[PDB]
Amino acid sequence: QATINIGTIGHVAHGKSTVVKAISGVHTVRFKNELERNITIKLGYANAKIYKLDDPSCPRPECYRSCGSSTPDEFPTDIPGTKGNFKLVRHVSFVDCPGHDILMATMLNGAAVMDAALLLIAGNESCPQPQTSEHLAAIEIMKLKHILILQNKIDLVKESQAKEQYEQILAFVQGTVAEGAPIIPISAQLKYNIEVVCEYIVKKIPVPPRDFTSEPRLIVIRSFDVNKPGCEVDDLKGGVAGGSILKGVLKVGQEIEVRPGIVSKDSEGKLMCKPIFSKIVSLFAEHNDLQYAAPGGLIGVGTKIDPTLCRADRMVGQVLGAVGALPEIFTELEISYFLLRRLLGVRTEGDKKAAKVQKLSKNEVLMVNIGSLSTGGRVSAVKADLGKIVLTNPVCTEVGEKIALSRRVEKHWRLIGWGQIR
């Protein structure tokens, strides 16, 4: 299954497929294939098995040696050991977030259900690069600090440039946790020092305490392509949710409720929403059958919903509770909030632009990323430490946790501040 969710976030032009296939062995893929204008801009999924030969390096199935195929310029070979079967240490899960700035709201959502991260830095561009800081700050807000910085694209980048970049990032982030996070330079054109990464992810990132006894909550981020094959139609025996569970052991045959709900017919107001109920058909993770779905892992829960809800990616950031979950489904919400004194996620080579953003004004639409949900809503009252927001689609608030608040600076929204629900 899975034990931890390590995320693979990282700004434009570092190469995703080479690094993702080295760590998991499962390609990051999605709609439009095709391939990728550059690096994956979709929310990729992948799981993997991490075993040892009693060595800090992680074998392949063929554990005698491993000859790469990253480049035919030279032969990159590494040796994990010699063969006689290897001991399974754990089953790991990844969360490949978008690597592009416009997709920030999606990157936030996907990130918010991980248990650790890997900041994929690229040495090609600017030293205190916008997105590195954006990522790091969001991570410390959500409730994580289990980060391993990875210098992923320094294959042709000289050692002065690459040294200056790690220095400037680590010096800018002087107020964000990063001093207890290692910085592992690797090759992505010769897959070198990959074996030492395997030592790091088992060290810096154990399994955090998971609450089995507590009531099941599944947070779905990705829909399912079911169905439409054959034989026997139409619509499906139904619809599969790619979600991570962050609380409770969800057992097979259990009934689960999707709690933001669907709005009642001919509503004259903003109420009333009614949750949808679906019975769990199957609990699939990796490529191995399971009867349980332990928390701390990203699992494909097939449920008895019908094709229309899964025919496109429409279940991004929905909260699912088993069953008749107590969590309130607000339509208008009381945010406590604070703002950054800089505009995060933007800063280029020349002061233009990135400074203090002006105070929020009422009746402006802002993206409130609450939980893994992403709703848009307008601010109806605006006091400094008390704003009232009215949301277009209702938000199930599992706990008052955190929020991330963004404002439409130009073409798309950009992160301005965070806070906590009251």
Partner: protein
């Protein structure tokens, strides 16, 4: 031999010819819309406009539609004209030309076995069989092909008048080989947008009831093209008997799914 019910053409009738020579004064041509009798076309009555080329108009080895302007009944001079021709007449004549060819090929199997050492053999077969098939249904626009097509799908037509031997197998084979496979363009149009989870089994009960009052063992063609769209090609007759199968079946699927939760497309 003759391809037509009458031996000689009338006056103002649309016919077909095949050019075998090009004359100074027009075109002398053989018929293949009747006997191989001679008919003369004249240069003046071919068009109402100039004529630069001449082999990019009429040339040898071409079927050309034309109107019989005059006929000498006793002499056998079939005067001809291409001046009054419309494309609608060409469609009507090409069909009659093609249909006579296939019908005479059916009435050639008869002559393969019987005494045909003399050319008049086919003429003997043609007059006695063809006329009673087509004359009864010429006034409604049918050829002898209609009579034979009716016989294969209900055999009483060719048993109502003298039935030949060995003919019947080849007759059946050629009717059933060429005029089929044989066909239903019945497709169901069904739209559904469920909030149900019991929809998967609900649809199964609805699918198997596409035709009411049939056995549970009836074979049908289910098709899934998209998630809301359920196409059922219903029991394949001719699409004039499965009309009730198409129309009322659509009501079943849309009704069965509304009972288990929510509103749907009607």
């Amino acid at each position: 031999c003759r391809f037509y019910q009458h031996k000689f053409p009338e006056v103002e009738d649309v016919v077909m010819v095949n050019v075998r020579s090009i004359a100074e004064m027009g075109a002398y041509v053989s018929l293949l819309e009747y006997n191989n009798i001679e008919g003369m076309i004249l240069l003046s009555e071919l068009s109402r406009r100039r004529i630069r080329s001449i082999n990019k108009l009429i040339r040898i080895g071409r079927n050309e539609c034309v109107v019989v302007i005059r006929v000498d009944k006793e002499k056998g001079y079939i005067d001809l004209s291409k001046r009054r021709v419309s494309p609608e007449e060409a469609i009507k004549c090409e069909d009659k030309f093609t249909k006579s060819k296939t019908v005479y090929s059916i009435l050639r199997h008869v002559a393969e076995v019987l005494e045909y050492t003399k050319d008049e053999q086919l003429e003997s077969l043609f007059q006695r069989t063809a006329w009673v098939f087509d004359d009864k249904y010429k006034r409604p626009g049918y050829g002898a092909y209609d009579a034979f097509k009716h016989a294969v799908s209900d055999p009483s037509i060719l048993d109502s008048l003298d039935l030949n031997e060995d003919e019947r197998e080849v007759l059946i084979n050629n009717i059933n080989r060429r005029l089929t496979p044989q066909a239903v363009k019945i497709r169901a149009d069904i739209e559904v947008a469920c909030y149900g989870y019991e929809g998967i089994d609900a649809v199964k009960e609805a699918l198997r009831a596409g035709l009411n009052c049939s056995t549970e063992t009836m074979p049908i063609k289910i098709n899934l093209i998209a998630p809301p769209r359920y196409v059922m090609t219903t029991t394949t007759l001719e699409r004039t008997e499965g009309l009730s199968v198409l129309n009322q079946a659509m009501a079943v699927i849309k009704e069965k799914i509304e009972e288990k939760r929510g509103v749907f497309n009607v």
